[PDB]
């Protein structure tokens, strides 16, 4: 397929596997998730600009708005977790084992 | 598939309007007034044929009528036009509003020596009509035959023969 799109998808999959491999923090998970959003923005933008398709120019702005509202929701969840425990560690989030 | 058919380099030779963009923009309204008919024949041919290869002779007529326009400027009103496009050419955005006295002198000499009235605000953006002697392109997209649609339903709606027929449900 097309050349720069392979790079943007590869960036998406690297940030996916970063989200799919937790090390320590919930903030690193939100970072990998929003890197996924960034790569989606770049890829949608490059397609819509390449196609000269006019009415989808407003699409990546809406992607950015909805997913940054999503990220605000994730930061508030992380803050409530960190006020419960003291740290935002993912191993403090394991009370639902039983 | 098939060989794409291109015109020869002798089909593409025409005398070029070798002037700059400010020179074109300075005579723009008089060009739209005076060279109206071959320009509009060409743009009708261009939005109807949808192909630059079927429009070459009308484009040559456009280039010819543009050259005759600028020769007719050159024979009569060379110095007011040069004074006007120099002042148009100084500007970065090439403003008309910075150059009203040179515009007035150019329009004065052109209306005196040639009788060309500069078009009013609104005229050059009108949709005009063009009389042509070429046929209308019956398939400009070169679409092949369309697939035959699925047959619709017709006839009245009789009830279900012995109901739902779901294993033992008699209705």
């Amino acid at each position: 397929m097309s050349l720069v799109y392979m790079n943007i998808m590869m960036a998406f999959t690297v940030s996916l596997t970063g989200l799919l491999m937790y090390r320590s923090h919930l903030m690193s998970s939100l970072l990998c998730l929003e890197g996924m959003m960034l790569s989606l923005f770049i890829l949608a933008t490059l397609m819509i600009l390449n196609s000269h398709f006019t009415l989808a120019s407003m699409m990546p702005i809406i992607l950015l708005v909805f997913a940054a509202c999503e990220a605000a929701l994730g930061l508030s969840l992380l803050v409530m977790v960190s006020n419960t425990y003291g740290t935002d560690y993912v191993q403090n989030l394991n009370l639902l084992q039983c | 598939p098939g060989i794409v058919e291109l015109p020869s380099l002798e089909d593409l030779k025409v005398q070029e309007v070798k002037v700059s963009s400010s020179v074109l923009k300075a005579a723009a309204h008089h060009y739209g007034a005076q060279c109206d008919k071959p320009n509009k024949e060409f743009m009708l041919c261009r939005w109807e044929e949808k192909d630059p290869r079927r429009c070459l002779e009308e484009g040559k007529l456009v280039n010819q009528c543009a050259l005759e326009f600028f020769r007719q400027i050159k024979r009569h009103c060379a110095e007011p036009f040069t004074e006007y496009w120099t002042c148009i050419d100084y500007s970065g955005l090439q403003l008309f509003r910075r150059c009203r006295k040179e515009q007035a002198q150019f329009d004065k000499c052109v209306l005196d020596k040639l009788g060309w009235v500069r078009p009013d605000l609104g005229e050059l953006s009108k949709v005009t009509k063009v009389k042509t002697d070429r046929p209308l392109p019956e398939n400009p997209y070169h679409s092949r035959a369309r697939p035959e649609p699925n047959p619709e339903v017709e006839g009245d709606l009789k009830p279900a023969r012995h109901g739902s027929r779901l294993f033992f449900w008699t209705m």
Partner: protein, 120 residues
């Protein structure tokens, strides 16, 4: 399956060609069973709130029965409509494609040979 049929007239619960069909009678055994479901919902509604089950809330049990019969009448009308559409589409498709639905030759049993398997 039949989603391409009701796409040209979307979100019609009962189309205008449903009215060529006879409606279910009010003595329909399916509708009588739905009224029985309304009566059972009324009885459970008195039972779960600790009321005398056959006595309390006759207005309430009667609205239960009436509501289930009222919904189930239009449900049975749509059911009859969709099976009528199924059979109409089937018969028009058999009539339109004869080469895929040939009449198979029914041979009498004097020519039809079956292998006999004795039980002994």
């Amino acid at each position: 399956m039949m989603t391409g049929r009701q796409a040209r007239a979307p979100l019609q619960f009962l189309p205008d060609e449903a009215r060529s069909l006879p409606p279910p009678k009010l003595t329909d055994p399916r509708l009588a069973y739905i009224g029985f479901l309304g009566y059972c919902s009324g009885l459970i509604d008195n039972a779960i709130r600790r009321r005398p089950v056959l006595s309390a809330g006759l207005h309430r049990q009667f609205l239960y029965i009436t509501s289930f019969v009222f919904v189930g009448y239009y449900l049975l009308k749509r059911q009859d409509y969709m099976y009528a559409v199924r059979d109409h589409d089937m018969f028009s498709y058999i009539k339109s494609h004869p080469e895929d639905f040939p009449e198979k030759d029914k041979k009498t049993y004097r020519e039809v040979f079956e292998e006999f398997h004795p039980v002994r």
